Amino acid sequence: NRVMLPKAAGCGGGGSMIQRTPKIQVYSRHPAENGKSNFLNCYVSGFHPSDIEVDLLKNGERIEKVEHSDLSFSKDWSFYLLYYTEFTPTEKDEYACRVNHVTLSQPKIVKWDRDGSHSMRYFYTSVSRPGRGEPRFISVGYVDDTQFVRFDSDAASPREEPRAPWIEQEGPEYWDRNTQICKTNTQTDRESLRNLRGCYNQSEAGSHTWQTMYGCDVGPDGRLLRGHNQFAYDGKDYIALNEDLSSWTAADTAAQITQRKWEAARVAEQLRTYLEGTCVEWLRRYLENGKETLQRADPPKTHVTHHPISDHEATLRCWALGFYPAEITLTWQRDGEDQTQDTELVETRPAGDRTFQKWAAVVVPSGEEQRYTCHVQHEGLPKPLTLRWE
Ligand SMILES: [Cl-]
């Protein structure tokens, strides 16, 4: 259940804008077997700003009826989206993903090369679109790595919408209240965007991004472990509530003006009341109503593959599949010693069925594959797994 958020203050500097080009992964939900129905995924992550174009291709032809996830972002404020389609692969039918973004000068194509504690978070993204109407407002709510609501200001009838089966039982006063909070926050974000543009002497002709996150973490007993509330402008920290839930950290002079305004208005006190009360209380409720899924950890299915590169070298890839929640640690060791330097780690990616996937790769002198073991830490495993190349 949401909280009404404060407005950034109107007012030095000209600002600064972070741009991040998308990381792209194309993969199937399950290990692909010709003739068996499956899902083809294109996961784009780590990008900023949020406008992006993603197509799935089948033998170079764009696939129609591709669906995608609701816009959300990671702790560094960068965005991620999953695009996916049901399909049946063959041995020569070809699939790929084509991505365009402001950071690219031509569309980028990557082919399908088949070779305890809990948290609640709400994420908000507002993006102005000068000359093209009001800002786009999208907000999603998560319990751990399970999305349970979305609000999109561009929907035909913008409303808080259920996205997990255990939230559907909430009554109409719940949907009414949270829809109202979203609609109000839409307008608050519009004012924040206006005030921020003024603070940095920025033109009304340019697009800017205002992101908000808040939420709470609880232990196994249900007590509040900590609360969060952070804001970002154009992809960088702007102001954040400190862990004491009583003071702010402001990134620059303009944010200090917001800090002084929110101190005078006792915003931190209102957020503390929410985080210690409503937030933890509803999270505890959701965990009980969704216990069959939210409180079941799925351990990873793991295996190691061998990929020869040269005579004197080869790549070992350690795979983890079908795990929930997304938090996982994969580490390669040589004679038990972590190979921090030479390991390649991809971003953890959704399979599309609530579970997640990840791999870790290390380059090895051929003939010495046996001195290397992969080391998997996950909440669903009583203690770490170790695997060797067999
Ligand atoms: Cl993250």
Author numbering: 323 to 333, 996 to 1099, 2001 to 2275
Source paper text:
Human leukocyte antigen (HLA) B∗39:06, B∗39:01, and B∗38:01 are closely related class I MHC allotypes that nonetheless show differential association with T1D. HLA class I molecules consist of an allele-specific heavy chain that is associated noncovalently with β2-microglobulin (β2m) and a presented peptide. The α1 and α2 domains of the heavy chain form the peptide-binding groove, which is characterized by six pockets designated A-F. In general, two well-conserved primary anchor residues occupy the B and F pockets and are located at position two and the C terminus of the peptide, respectively. Upon identifying a peptide that binds to both HLA-B∗39:06 and B∗39:01, we determined the respective X-ray structures of the two allotypes presenting this peptide to 1.7 Å resolution.
